[PDB]
Every structure is written in structure tokens, then in C-alpha cells.
Amino acid sequence: ESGQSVDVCNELEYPWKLITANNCIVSTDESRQSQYIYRTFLLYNTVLTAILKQNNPFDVIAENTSISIIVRNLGSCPNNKDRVKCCDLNYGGVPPGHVMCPPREITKKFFHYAKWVRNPNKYKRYSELIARQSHARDVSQLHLLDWENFMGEFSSYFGLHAHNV
DNA sequence: TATTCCAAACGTTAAAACCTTTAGGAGAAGTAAAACAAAAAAAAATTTAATTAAATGG
Secondary structure, three states: OOOOOOOOOOOOOHHHHHHOOOOOOOOOHHHHHHHHHHHHHHHHHHHHHHHEOOOOHHHOOOOOOOHHHHHHHHOEEOOEEEEEOHHHOOEOOOOOHHHHOOEOHHHHHHHHHHHHHHOOOOOHHHHOHHHOOOOHHHHHHHHHHHHHHHHHHHHHHOOOOHHHO
16 A cells, blocks of 8 residues: 555556556566666666677577577686676777676576567566576575676766666 | 586476367258059949739729
């Protein structure tokens, strides 16, 4: 009851809603974290594309593309192996090196969440994917910790307040 | 001792395909009636003998 609950998937007018309702799903905190990670890594991909003097392999949503093979291509970042070796990439701006090296399993679960889009109607098959507890509690919570570490260090790297989420 | 990924079996959720149940139309044998013609059986009429009714007659 508390807060603004008027935003419901019954967004028609009294009779027309009485006839049919908007397509909708169940939202829960864990899928919300999945979405946060998703949007933030979309932002990260956009910034890479912007400062890149080469293509951005992390920007292709095709099928045969697999985060596994791309990871195998690029590999763990030197000063932090949990990250990825984006330091060697080619930027039109001066290479910041390690600065652009996100974690590993975070990107894995990001890609698996992304490949959801093929059939959104099977929403639950990936609704929670990134932050799933499939112990695994430690694994996924520390993955969230690593992701938010990347988020904050990026934000500080460009003066962005951590509160802009 | 204890990693590290790299590969690999397994479960579960959708898609797709498949069998199902019912519904509408299509001939198809089966029953039946339509009709056909002999056969049998009944009916109809026939003719004589017998009977009686009546006139002729001991």
C-alpha cells in the first residue's frame, strides 16, 4: 500500500480495461538487479564505442556470438584477473588501460540475460538470470559487489557521482 | 593441496507436430414397396328331377 501504486498494467479506461489489460509480468528485486546490471553495462558499451578507435565486439546481439568465445579471445585483465583485458584495446582517446576492464562472470550473466530478447514471452526463463541463486548466495552476491565496484570506479573515473544510478 | 578452465551430462520450458473428437456431406447396401403374372378357390350361373299347387277330373 505505501508509495505510489497507481502504476499498474491495467492501463485502459474503465470499460476497455474491463475488456482487456496490458501484457504484464511479475517484477521482483532480483530481476531488478539484473536490469540494473543490464542498463549499466549498456552504458559501458556505449562509452567504449564512443572512445574506441576500433569496433566494439561487446555490442553485437547476434546468435552465434557467445560471451564464452569472446572472453576466450580477450581474457582476464592483468592487474585484476577477475576483470577482462580491455586495457590492450584501441581508443581514439588516450588508452586508459585497465580502467575499462569489467569483471568476468558479470559479463557472462549479462550476455545470458541479453540473449533473452529472442522470445520475451518466455520471460521467466531469463527474468532473474543475472542475480539468480541457482554457496551460490556468496557467488552471486559477490558478483553484485564486483559489478558495483566497477560502477563506482567508473563513476569516479569520470567525476560522476555514485548517486546517479 | 588446491586451483583453473573446458567439456559435458540433464531438466525444464517452450515450439511444432501429431493424434483426437467432433461435424458436415457422400455414396451404399437393405428393406421395401411397386408391380406382374399364374394358380386355386370361390362364386355364379345353369338345368333336371322332384314337388307342389292348382286346374281337370269317376
